[PDB]
A paper describes a structure:
An unexpected homodimeric form of ctMex67 was also observed in which the two copies of ctMex67NTF2L formed a dimer analogous to that in S. cerevisiae NTF2. Two copies of the LRR domain were also present in the asymmetric unit, but the LRR-NTF2L linker was disordered. However, the previously ordered pre-α1 loop that gave rise to the asymmetry in the NTF2L–Mtr2 region was now disordered, perhaps thereby allowing the symmetric homodimeric Mex67 to be generated. Moreover, ctMex67LRR-NTF2L appeared to form a homodimer in solution, and in size-exclusion chromatography coupled with multi-angle light scattering the protein migrated as a single peak with a molecular mass of 82 g mol−1, consistent with a dimer (each chain has a theoretical mass of 42 g mol−1). The homodimeric complex of NTF2L domains in the ctMex67LRR-NTF2L crystals was unanticipated because it had been thought that complex formation between Mex67 and Mtr2 was a prerequisite for efficient nuclear export of mRNA. Although SEC-MALS indicated that ctMex67LRR-NTF2L is homodimeric in solution, whether Mex67 is ever not complexed to Mtr2 in vivo is currently unclear and whether the configuration observed simply represents an inactive form of the Mex67–Mtr2 complex or whether homodimeric Mex67 has another role in the cell has yet to be established.
Residue numbers in the entry: 381 to 556
Write the structure that this text describes.
């Protein structure tokens, strides 16, 4: 199971050494997205994304009830990831915590040009984690859904597969 192998490594790194993930799996073609709500009072990630978008003037005003999405190109991924809260994810060994779906996506082009089509992998992850922001002194449990789109990597890549798209949706944050 490639998804389990990828997610086990991905989330362990995401907790302790996330920036390592970018050179390994991410490239110039990749896009990263975060969906969050402005309404939440004690949400650390929402404030982090909100401040980040404002600083780079990326933010576009919407109704408070309306959901907000922040998407960044390859150059901005590292800086955005830095700002996001520290997280501790439960091991995938605990089946109750994670719901993982892995599906083939045979619509991708072949970078080599050797074959007409290239095999693509789509990974959807439902999980929970412990989000802590020390500077704010905010601690809580997060509910999230994350979607990965995997395709064949470009030449000189560390790994055979790369992340074409990464979409993170922040649903609920429970204090203490």
């Amino acid at each position: 199971n490639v998804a389990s192998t990828f997610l086990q490594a991905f989330f362990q790194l995401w907790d302790h050494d996330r920036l390592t993930l970018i050179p390994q799996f991410y490239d110039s073609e990749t896009t990263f997205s975060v969906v969050f709500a402005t309404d939440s009072p004690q949400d650390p990630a929402s404030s982090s994304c909100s401040k980040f978008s404002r600083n780079l003037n990326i933010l576009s005003p919407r109704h408070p009830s309306t959901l907000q999405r922040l998407f960044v190109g390859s150059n901005l991924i590292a800086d955005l990831w830095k700002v996001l809260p520290a997280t501790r994810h439960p091991s995938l060994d605990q089946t109750s915590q994670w719901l993982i779906d892995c599906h083939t996506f045979p619509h991708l082009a072949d970078p080599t040009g050797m074959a007409p089509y290239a095999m693509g992998l789509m990974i959807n992850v439902n999980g929970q984690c412990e989000e802590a922001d020390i500077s704010q002194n905010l601690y809580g449990t997060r509910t999230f859904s994350r979607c990965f789109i995997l395709g064949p990597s470009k030449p000189g890549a560390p790994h055979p597969y790369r992340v074409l798209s990464d979409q993170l949706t922040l649903h609920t944050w429970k204090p203490q």
